[PDB]
Design a protein around this ligand. Structure first.
Ligand SMILES: COc1cccc(NC(=S)N(CCO)Cc2cc3cc(C)c(C)cc3[nH]c2=O)c1
Ligand SMILES: COc1cccc(NC(=S)N(CCO)Cc2cc3cc(C)c(C)cc3[nH]c2=O)c1
Lengths: 603, 603
């Protein structure tokens, strides 16, 4: 369906993020049968929203729980909301939600990183209290967007396994809200900026609408009406403009009016005049040779999970700004939109990514019981549904982020195994369909190191080359000397194979803060520094390398294992954001360069 | 040959483990070509002996060197040593060592952990100064104990790889010494102590002499002559005795005299009167069921590597005494004899082990594909020669340690892969040889967990079942509930399969000192505590379990990889001997039991 980011004019919101809700586990899965949502959850306790449920209670049994949990809370609908449109919206519900307003089932959602909403006017009465009950599921299976497998034990209980690193946080991770609309209402919008050698340029509106006529007006930074359009379906305004750029990120505001003889609906959609596409081995934003810096990130932090948080947000960006990141990627799931609004506002370049992670079964590291399906693409394991579920996941992200100028690229998935058979048959359609959803931006699929330049059957189908590489770490462990060869050899081997522009979307080594070594070896701070030094030395000797993003901005939490010391320790910063000695090395390189500019194959 | 430990009676040492020697690498392998023993080493820096060489200089390139190194040093023969048998002895040179006295090659030994000595009188002049060059080699191959594979890259640069955890430290790890005897001298002794429901018994004695009549007397603790003996290679002495006992290890002293017509020799051998035997599922010391507590340990510490050190020894023994440990295993190689004299004197029970770890090609870390012989027991890999070099390692160990009453059993190997056929072919004759070499102690071979009760092909050939188990950590990771079911089922399978006594000789988890967690998950101090505790509950349920040796006394250096965060962290103590909180857990369990005695299945 249609997603529009709420803002506040002929519409206003009660955020329900007001944190404390009633909470409970349903270890018997008797909750739907016993119709829990008709009265107050019993045996509950306070929980905060937004945040993951897992770590709020310091309890392993809750942390590793799998199945359904219940959220409940009450809330007076504002008196002024008349006969108006009342709309309940969740920015995310991690993995799956079902919603009961008093007794009315109003909503259902699968996907954990994108919004869903419903018109609730008929079971609500403005000026009165209404119960809100949410049922939340955190289970993953094969047609799910990260896939996974729930093993039920003989003894009654579930237990989740899956194929990615990062830990399976679940819950209401983002803002909920009740919001208000006129019965005339904008409900969809799309916008495209074309650029021309940097002198002048044009933007297209298209806009689905609740019944009404659209006056479309584009405003200055200073609110001077410099673009006007008529029509409820389409326009193009060719004004000679001020562009969205990386150092600075200028933005226009396109108000959107939908009219009836009774009503009016007014919408400001921030807009960045920017063009994105690839030319040969170059990446082009406003027809310029960019160079990417920054990291893969996660939504992870002590206590809250992947739960959204303003302070955290403000601090991390301060940190990225300081250290010279111009860009980052939404590692392995759609992030809360606020990050993107900030990126636009601040001109930060974003490779936007779907939750399609862990399609891979070789990854890995198993001393344990094998199964585990034999064929990756099978009706058993990655199947028809799964391509369809996956398709739907790509719609939504694009539905949400097409209008965010900061997004210069889409990412279809991260590290799928492309050595098994259906791997090109699975990936070709979605690659086509992606561009049929948005042809304004290039599209990639992020590449695991064992589908290497001679074995990977999928890369031509995409526009840019996104590599995750560990050459001294998982292989050649500890050996910078031979690691540098393999890496360059393999970067050159990609350059000729595909003659595409190359970005390393993951390069990094586990490092324990405070571990220091005169022998400069694995897990030491010094080693991280030497290893990043080297990867760097090597992108300076390759023309096709136009992007660099460090494995992890900060240490995050993982599934429990032998290869993870209390989590992934590959952060430049610790989880509480204290900088490892490598923050200061990246500091120099990233602020020493010219903005958006590769070195002189040296410096 | 014959090995007796030098002491000071007619006999006299000049230590010369005075440790400042000259030192250098040989990178182009010129050393034997250019007869370096002939002239004082060039480009030679000072190094401490005893010590491992790898860590004294804070240089990665020296630390990771593979090849040949040289130790050189001048000494003074005491003028007093006039008519004298002058012997040059090395307590260990790690892996192989070749020795020159001033352009006269006197020795060569392969093995890194037991002594070799030469009668050098004719190449030295009492009261003059000599130059001593040692060429030490640290490489491993399929015939070395332990085995390994040096890999030479395309450049001729050698790189050692091996199949055990701990770091290949090399160098002169133990004292060197010149020592003296008369030309009539005892050069081998053997003692067997017998006992019968404990009121009084005998000690058979076998004595090999260099040119003399032998006589023999048994002196008391307070030095009074409790019995007497005459004859050369045969005697037996009877006694009403204070047995050597795990708590306290009472010691008589046997006094050996070799008499010529002219010359005289005197050798004191400490004797502990005690019997050791398996009876069914029990391990009997002086006819009483005993229960082992304590550690597998390593020879490792900062800076010195495996270099022996007195302060370190006294400190670790205060720690083990404090914590309630009554025993250990010389994990992985023979330890400094000093370690066994200590045991003898304080009544510590020891499991003495060869350096034959690494027989297995199946404990790989992941995914560096290559490449290792596909058949473990094959002419390419573990072959007739290997079995010889292994038999030799057994001989040398027993020759050294046979009179140590603290040694109660011999372990022949640690974690060989016993699945491949011919495992049994390879070990049966070693088992047999070992018993013949010393008929007085039970024998074992430490068992790796993926050779399990149903797959192992070797354990019926040995007397005591020693198991290295990691359920909850390498397998069932993090899951105590299910680790515990699997541990118990497996221990019961072994009891029913073999009806031998079971000692768990490794159980432990990596624990980063200072990582604390409410979730009690994998790398935290709390997990280390809960995991050992679960293991303990199960041991107390299984009647064949007769001992527990926690895997690591202290953290230790390993080769680099993704599984070892700067070493093995299964320490109870850190490498600098600081206690982790599991230290106090073990302390309570071990000092709270009745000494030497299995709990009652209960707290
Ligand atoms: C199931 O969730 C988990 C749990 C714990 C660790 C991981 N690891 C992950 S995601 N990575 C991918 C790094 O971008 C490490 C990894 C690399 C790797 C490389 C090669 C060349 C091979 C042959 C096998 C490999 N196996 C691996 O595991 C995943
Ligand atoms: C630095 O030296 C290195 C280098 C690389 C790896 C290691 N790992 C080591 S020593 N172990 C200790 C085993 O007692 C972990 C281990 C457990 C294991 C368990 C099962 C059940 C199976 C089937 C396979 C397994 N493989 C393993 O490797 C050590």
């Amino acid at each position: 369906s249609h997603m529009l980011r709420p803002v506040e004019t002929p519409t206003r919101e009660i955020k329900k993020l007001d944190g404390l809700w009633a909470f409970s586990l349903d270890r018997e899965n008797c909750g739907i049968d016993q119709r829990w949502w008709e009265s107050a959850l019993q045996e509950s306790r306070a929980i905060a929203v937004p945040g993951s449920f897992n770590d709020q209670f310091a309890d392993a049994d809750i942390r590793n729980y799998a199945g359904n949990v219940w959220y409940q809370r009450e809330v007076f609908i504002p008196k002024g909301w008349a006969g108006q449109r009342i709309v309940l919206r969740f920015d995310a519900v991690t993995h799956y939600g079902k919603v009961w307003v008093n007794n009315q089932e109003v909503m259902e959602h699968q996907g954990g990183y994108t919004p869903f909403e419903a018109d609730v006017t008929p079971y609500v009465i403005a000026g009165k209290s209404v119960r809100i009950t949410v049922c939340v599921n955190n289970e993953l299976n094969w047609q799910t967007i990260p896939p996974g497998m729930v093993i039920t034990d003989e003894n009654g209980k579930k237990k989740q396994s899956y194929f990615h690193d990062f830990f399976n946080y679940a819950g209401i991770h983002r803002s909920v809200m009740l919001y208000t609309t006129p019965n005339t209402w904008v409900d969809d919008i799309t916008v495209v900026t074309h650029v021309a050698q940097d002198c002048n340029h044009a933007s297209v509106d298209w806009q689905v609408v609740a019944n009404g006529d659209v006056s479309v007006e584009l405003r200055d930074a200073d609110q001077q009406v410099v673009a006007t359009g008529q029509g409820t379906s389409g326009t193009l305004q060719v004004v000679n403009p001020h562009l969205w750029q990386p150092g600075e990120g200028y933005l226009y505001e396109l108000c959107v009016t939908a009219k009836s003889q009774t009503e009016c609906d007014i919408y400001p959609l921030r807009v960045g005049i920017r063009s994105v596409a690839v030319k040969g081995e170059q990446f082009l934003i406003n027809h310029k040779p960019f160079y990417f810096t920054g990291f893969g990130r996660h939504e992870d932090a002590d206590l809250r999970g992947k739960g959204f948080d303003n302070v955290l947000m403000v601090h991390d960006h301060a940190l990225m700004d300081w250290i010279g990141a111009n860009s980052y990627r939404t590692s392995h799931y759609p992030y809360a939109e606020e990050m993107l609004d900030w990126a636009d506002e601040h001109g930060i370049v974003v490779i936007d990514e779907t939750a399609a992670v862990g399609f891979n079964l070789s990854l890995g590291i198993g001393f344990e019981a094998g199964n585990k399906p034999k064929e990756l693409y099978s009706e058993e394991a990655v199947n028809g549904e799964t391509q369809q579920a996956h398709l739907q996941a790509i719609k939504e992200l694009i539905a949400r982020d097409k209008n965010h100028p900061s997004v210069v690229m889409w990412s279809i998935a991260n590290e799928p195994d492309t050595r098994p058979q259906g791997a090109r048959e699975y990936f070709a359609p979605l690659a086509e369909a992606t561009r049929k959803l948005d042809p304004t931006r290039p599209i990639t699929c992020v590449n695991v190191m064992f589908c290497d330049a001679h074995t990977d059957t999928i890369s031509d189908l995409f526009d840019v080359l996104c590599l995750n590489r560990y050459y001294g770490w998982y292989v050649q462990s500890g050996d910078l000397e031979t690691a540098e060869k393999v890496l360059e050899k393999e970067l050159l081997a990609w350059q000729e194979k595909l003659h595409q522009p190359i970005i390393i979307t993951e390069y990094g080594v586990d490092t324990l803060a405070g571990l220091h070594s005169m022998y400069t070896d694995m897990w030491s701070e010094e080693y991280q520094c030497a290893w990043l030094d080297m990867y760097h030395r090597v992108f300076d000797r390759v023309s096709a390398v136009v992007g660099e993003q460090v494995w992890n901005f900060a240490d995050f939490a993982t599934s429990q294992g032998i290869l993870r010391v209390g989590g992934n320790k590959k952060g430049i910063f610790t989880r509480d954001r204290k900088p490892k000695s490598a923050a200061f090395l990246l500091q120099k390189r990233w602020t020493g360069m010219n903005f958006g500019e590769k070195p002189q194959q040296g410096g």
